Amino acid sequence: NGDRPRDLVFPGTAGLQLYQSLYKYSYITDGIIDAHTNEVISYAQIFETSCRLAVSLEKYGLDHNNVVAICSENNIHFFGPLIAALYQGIPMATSNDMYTEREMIGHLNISKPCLMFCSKKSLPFILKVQKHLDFLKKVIVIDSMYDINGVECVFSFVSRYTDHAFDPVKFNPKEFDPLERTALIMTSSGTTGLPKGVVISHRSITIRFVHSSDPIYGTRIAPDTSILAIAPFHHAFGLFTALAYFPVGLKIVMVKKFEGEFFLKTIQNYKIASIVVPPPIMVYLAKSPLVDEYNLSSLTEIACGGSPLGRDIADKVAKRLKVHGILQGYGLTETCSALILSPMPYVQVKVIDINTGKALGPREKGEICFKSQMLMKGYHNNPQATRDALDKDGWLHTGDLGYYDEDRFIYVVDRL
Amino acid sequence: IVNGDRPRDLVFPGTAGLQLYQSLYKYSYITDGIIDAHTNEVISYAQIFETSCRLAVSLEKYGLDHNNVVAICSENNIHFFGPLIAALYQGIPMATSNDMYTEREMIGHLNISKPCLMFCSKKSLPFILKVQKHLDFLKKVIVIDSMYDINGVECVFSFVSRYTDHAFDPVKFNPKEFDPLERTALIMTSSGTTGLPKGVVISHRSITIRFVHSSDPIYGTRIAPDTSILAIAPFHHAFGLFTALAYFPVGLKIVMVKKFEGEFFLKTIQNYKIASIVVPPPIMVYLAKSPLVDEYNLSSLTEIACGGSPLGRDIADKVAKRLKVHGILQGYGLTETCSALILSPMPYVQVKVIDINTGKALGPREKGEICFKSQMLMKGYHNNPQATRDALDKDGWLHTGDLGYYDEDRFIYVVDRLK
Amino acid sequence: IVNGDRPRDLVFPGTAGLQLYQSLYKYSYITDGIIDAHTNEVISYAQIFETSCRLAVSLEKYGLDHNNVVAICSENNIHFFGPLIAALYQGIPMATSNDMYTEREMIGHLNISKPCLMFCSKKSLPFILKVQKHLDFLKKVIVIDSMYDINGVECVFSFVSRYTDHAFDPVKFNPKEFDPLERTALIMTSSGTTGLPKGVVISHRSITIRFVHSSDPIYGTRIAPDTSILAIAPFHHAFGLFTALAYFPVGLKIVMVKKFEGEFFLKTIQNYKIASIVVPPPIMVYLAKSPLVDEYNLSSLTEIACGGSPLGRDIADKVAKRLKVHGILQGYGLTETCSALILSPMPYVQVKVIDINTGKALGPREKGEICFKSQMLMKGYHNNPQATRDALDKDGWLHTGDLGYYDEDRFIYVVDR
Amino acid sequence: ENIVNGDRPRDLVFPGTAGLQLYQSLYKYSYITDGIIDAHTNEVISYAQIFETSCRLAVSLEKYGLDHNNVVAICSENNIHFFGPLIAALYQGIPMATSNDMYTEREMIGHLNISKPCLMFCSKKSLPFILKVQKHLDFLKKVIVIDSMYDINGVECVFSFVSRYTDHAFDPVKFNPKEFDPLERTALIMTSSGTTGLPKGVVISHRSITIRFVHSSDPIYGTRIAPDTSILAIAPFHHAFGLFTALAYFPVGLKIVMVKKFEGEFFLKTIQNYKIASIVVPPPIMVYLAKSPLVDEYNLSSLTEIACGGSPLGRDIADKVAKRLKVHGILQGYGLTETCSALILSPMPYVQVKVIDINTGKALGPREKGEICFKSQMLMKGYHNNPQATRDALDKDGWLHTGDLGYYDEDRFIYVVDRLKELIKYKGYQVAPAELENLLLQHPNISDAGVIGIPDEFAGQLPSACVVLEPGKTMTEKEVQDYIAELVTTTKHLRGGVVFIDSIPKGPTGKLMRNELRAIFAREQAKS
């Protein structure tokens, strides 16, 4: 079973939650800051822009039977269109910005999206790729006020379908079943050798929100101190840890790429309360030099949500930077990462049999596997690997064996 | 048809209990939940969480439900919320009695709700027994703030340990579910307009909405969950109880003073670094034109609110200035009902104008009698069908007693011409 | 021939446009360019730089030049300077209309310059469209403080994106060149001498000189480029427009209040840590002898100035003392023209005293009609050559209508009998 | 045509005389009372003091009968009063010769004979010397002490001198400086040697100085700190770097405090006890700044900005310091034109540049290799009475050939990255790159330098490598030739064969001796 949720999951569309969040924390004036450029967007800005963009996507002719995409590096305006999709319940495919033409065409062919948001920086590569895909009917630039040789930008586009009197306080996000409407088709190159694009329900999101909100697990930090986002937005881990920052209204500062120093510079200079990084930036933290040459006395909380090596690099950092024991992930998935760490709310776990397939009780070995709403609703257009991944009734086979750690210790230890 | 702001927090649908429960469970880590400014006694959130749950199961197994009514009679006292929230879990209605009623008054009071069980204080117990000797329907008393029973009078601890054991776990307990709009949360007595002791009925929904207002960052007090607010207004009365209760869903260290007398208020706000206060207008005037109230360091003060008979004659401006505060806003007409609605219309609250000669539903900038409609409005008086149809009319409108006019679509606030 | 102080900063030779341009470019880094004390809207210097440059090329490609005259009708508003400065680049004259005119008055005004394009505010647009329905020559209106168009009315953003594109770089833009003394910068209408609608003409030179004055550390606001000054005086009007405009060449964070009324001025001056205020005498009296105006913390104030018929003996002294200020010194001369000349004889300003009867030049300490000569002076009235020759005489001297004298060679300052 | 232009100027150059802008400065910022402070003595002059003295000195010099066709000099250590005479020369348009104060008799005379100045200004300290010296020079008619109230043994001091010609009631605000074209008038005649190996006197225009000020005013480049805040001056005034960086402090009205000599830790103390905002220094005290102990035992928290304008130890001293002192970023330039240093730092306003052919000499394009040259007004204008060095240093039309070779990043990026810092290296039989195309573009395992050029065969010029390994790792000559046989193709490799040795060669922090390795190649083309 695993922990009882502290903040009850928001029933409705994740769109609707995010919407409400933006509206509440409109007062925040430092929504996102580009650590590099120093560009800054306010919550109120994302709010207006996302609403405008929603009525726009609609009147232009899009719905749930379509798929939209965004291909951009880690960038301030990214959330405008993303969030707009979530209002309308249009599915959003996120493309990694650095695919080679080769890889990328492979990707877009999975979801096959009719509209594509993208970055200034990524625009040429997108035009180059779009000339190979008859279905990619329109591209829109997200981070420009002016159009780029005939390519439209979110501003112009939006002013086509919305006017001077538009009031996002007066907008309503479309309503639907948040468990059967797709939010994201994020493609993943993990198992086998196929690209295969994974499907994320809205419920997976509002549950991920529950987790960001919970004060024993997710980041318990002041709704107006600055958290750093570094993880790739196009990728599941980075998109969700980032996106969950809004229901709780945090000043996000954000870095384009994990590499080098400057991680340091950045984290000192903005008074960063919490960071959420993958384990390479953990090693750079633990056993890298002159990383106390910058004042990092700002750091309240640290998280890891990918492939975390032993509890020793973890202690190296917990100690170096004076932290409340950095605790985190073990088992994280292709899907919404992290579940069962230091089981989680809305996630149930079982131990059955290598041989029978019947659920055991306590202190008994057998293959450990998961069931949750937060789990992928399967893959896209591939009925094969859908029924391949999660079994006869919603259990996702992990491929390890171990046991129920008893009633009085409902935690996870696994034998093989 | 003035609608009033769109809610920034969607109202929690379920039992008001359930939300409070959830709140407590979430902020269990908070250890300085309520402090008795006087004794220096302290309860933690997690303690209230446990106690309220144990007491919920106790009351249940003891055999009570929606068809009964419980009461609590206590002065402002840390343990007050113990039984109250437990009631809200089970959906037993709670009648709150004022501790300083005279026997005369009190009997009248209890005869409205006629509660079978009565929590009380320790210094209020004599009086409660003295009274119970006149009311056959009052089968049990329980003391809320004692560890031992008191000459046969049970106390909350003994009572709870009767039905629960050491391994009891509030994380595994569940508050009853019901329709939060048709379940009475509270029966708070008030003798208004006529002077008769009539008892007001409050839905759970009325509460969950009041929580929505408190969460709201333009209206309700926007300050960090784990900084200290002072609530002093009397808990048995709606203003003090709802403002107090609403502190929980947002997890604030409350400090609480038993009585508004002179200073010491000063003393406390200094000594506990009080971020926000919420007071009635007597301590407002005391704030503004009483001297050497800048002899204590009150520079902790982020937010100030007032919610009864607000002295519009700019005492408010004087305090806003004296204590360098983000301008004190509050008042703008409250009620017998859940106080405070339409401050500096509020979410889930709409107001109209109609005209006192026909009763239509007037449009912009036009006078006529102003009155409110809301889920948050009182569900009526109790075993009295008379003054119910009199307070709120044919379709959910409650006549307030002023004329004003709708300040246009483009200024959706309220100005009213004569009071 | 009292000459008046030697300038400390040599007047910039070129177009006033070019100077404002360079200013914007230099202080582009300033991120708190203008703040709407009311709303809390803020524009950055670089934003004005881009907006104004784009607007300049826009105005040019749209087909305008010096032979037209443009207008602006707006209340005190962050975006006011957008179009204005753009005109100055192109050397198109700008007529400023007071935003509170009656249709009655406003048309009278507009008929002086007869402008073909009109920028205006969100707030001013109803009244303006109403007015353009009476004037054949008013071909186009554009809104300055909106991102989207307003029922068929274009806005500056849209207008600008018609003629410039994404790759436009204002660092590569260059302001038109002309002689800054024969090119009109501004046509500000004024009701002086007679109740008749006469429009005053200001050359670029007058502005580049006004900039000379604001930079001067004995006279103009001597405070660090990146401290916050308050502009409250009406932008459509000369005193307010120029005190405001002169701030950019010295790069000051401007906070701006739409209206003088109430304690909101006090609040503002506190909440933004305001170094200098420059006010007309009503908020001067409100300053010295108004109550509980120390109930707000005004300890931020280094300098105070006044420039609208200054004589408040000794109200000025009452505030100088009230607000621990380096003694507020100012006024002592203001006009139809660029207000403020001879304050506490100014650079590039000469004053003489002559004879009420002959009109021949006096020497020291001697009575007779006092009057001025300066490049900063009005180049005359607009379509009225009658009152041009009436105001400034045969050889550039402009008669004030007072008498007095030279406070000597050894004290080249002005007292008048 | 293809030219890199350079950053639009954020302050348009002041048309007129350098003296005129310098006047107007002193007059505007007259109110500052801490103009220059002897960080040593504590003596202090104010701005309006300098304004006075300099205007006085100006009219004195004119009535004494001097004009452009003359040349006045000044020999002095770093001293408060330096600017009085200097600025008055600039007012009057008389050219000025800054002599180094610690020249020997021998050197000094060769110098003075370039400019042949008739008036010499001097400091108390420098007087004996200058007199000694003047007893050789018949052309040097008058000395004047600058930092002493009383005359010395008949040597007239500035005050007596000025008083002959101005009275009690003299007013500088009424004085006008002389007017001329700022571009044809010499301002300074500061001599520099090293190159070729002779005493040759550089010519700086007035415009060079106006431009110079334009850069100092530049809020991205020059020191952007508030007028009436304390900056430290410490580089010797009698050299161009120090003189102009000091002189330019005046148009922005700064409280200068100044130390006479760079040595030791008196520096920390001062920059502390005066609350010093910015500093501008040479790389000696850069490296002492970064790598030297307990320099964090004095409080250097006042330190907004740092510049560095000489031979920049771009090793990692710049970063170490920007870090230690938590400063907004010390970022400097590249060029060392020998005249007004710093042209192209992290092109500069009013400076342009192009790259040309090694062979033709036509302007190249983006990412095209060839010799770097600049052309700016701010550049030296020539040498004094020497038509030989002039037509050498700058070409036909004002371009200064750096002798380095590089290319310009992009026209949408006008930056100059440059591959191989000198031309006299890297020869081949159809030019080949040396110390930076390869060398630094190949290091497995890291093998520490080697690009020289062996004269054989009589068919060309053999390239050759001088590889050295560190942690005993065995590489062969034949082995390396094939790792970098595909790294460059054509024919490059090393012809002779990767020789292996101990270190690299000498020269101050970096600079090889090229012929060192060629001769060291010799004796090591004989063994196993």
Author numbering:
A (entry chain D): 8 to 349, 363 to 436
B (entry chain A): 6 to 349, 363 to 437
C (entry chain C): 6 to 349, 363 to 435
D (entry chain B): 4 to 349, 363 to 544
Excerpt from the paper describing this PDB structure:
The crystal structure of WT REPh was determined at low resolution by molecular replacement from two different crystal forms in the space groups P1 and P3121 at resolution of 3.05 Å and 3.60 Å, respectively. Unlike previously reported luciferases that are exclusively monomeric, in the P3121 crystal form, REPh exists as tetramer, although in the P1 crystal form it is an octamer in the asymmetric unit. The estimated molecular weight (MW) of the wild-type (WT) REPh from the SEC analysis was ≈ 240 kDa, which corresponds to the tetramer found in the P3121 crystal. Only one out of the four C-terminal domains was observed in the density maps of the P3121 crystal form and none of the eight C-terminal domains of the REPh octamer could be resolved in the P1 crystal form. Only molecule B of the P3121 crystal form has enough quality to trace the C-terminal domain that was not traceable in any of the molecules in the P1 crystal form. The C-terminal domain showed higher average B factors (69.4 Å2, with several regions with values above 100) relative to the N-terminal domain within the same crystal form (60.3 Å2). The aperture of the active site with an angle of ∼125° between axes crossing the center mass of each domain (P3121 crystal form) shows that REPh is the most open conformation among the known luciferase structures, which corresponds to the high mobility of its C-terminal domain. This feature indicates that the flexibility of the C-terminal domain may play a role in tuning the color of light emitted.
